[PDB]
Specification:
Chain B: This is Nuclease A. By secondary structure, chain A is an all-alpha fold. Chain A is 40% helix and 0% strand. Classes of the chains: A mainly alpha, B alpha+beta.
Chain lengths: 35, 121
């Protein structure tokens, strides 16, 4: 889905970024306060 | 390192930090404008909130982390090192501190969705 498309499985580092992302999303930090 | 294969990271020289993502580094004598893999900060996919980019802080923020660093490392993923626009795709580490992490963790950027459909599709 996402209306985005890539073929390569780039997962390397995604989990690192996304834990850090998740922290900030819940914190409503700057951009995450768009919601 | 999560993966068994540790990805290729090499030191680079900082030329300038343009945006909070898009920066210009010189690796092994090659000056390229890099942007941070898995990060999307400067130009939004489509600025929906308008102030959805946080450009002023974001671009300053990158300067803070990179200019205070003695050692600046560019690590490349299994995607690509370089994109057709002549811009590099890397993770920038400041003495081992991944600047990409700081951006998203500070809520100044979003993770750039590298797309995995399911498998082949």
């Amino acid at each position: 889905g996402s209306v985005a498309y890539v073929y390569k499985p780039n997962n390397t580092h995604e989990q690192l970024l996304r834990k850090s992302e998740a922290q900030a999303k819940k914190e409503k930090l700057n951009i995450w306060s768009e919601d | 390192a999560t993966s068994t294969k540790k990805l290729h990271k090499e030191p680079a020289t900082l030329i300038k930090a343009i945006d909070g993502d898009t920066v210009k580094l010189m690796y092994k004598g090659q000056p390229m404008t890099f942007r941070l893999l898995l990060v999307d900060t400067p130009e939004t996919k489509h600025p929906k909130k308008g102030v959805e980019k946080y450009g002023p802080e974001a671009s300053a923020f990158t300067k803070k982390m990179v200019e205070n660093a003695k050692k600046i490392e560019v690590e490349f993923d299994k995607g690509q090192r370089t994109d057709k626009y002549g811009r590099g795709l890397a993770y920038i580490y400041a003495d081992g501190k991944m600047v990409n992490e700081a951006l998203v963790r500070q809520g100044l950027a979003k993770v750039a969705y590298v797309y995995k459909p399911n498998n082949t599709h």
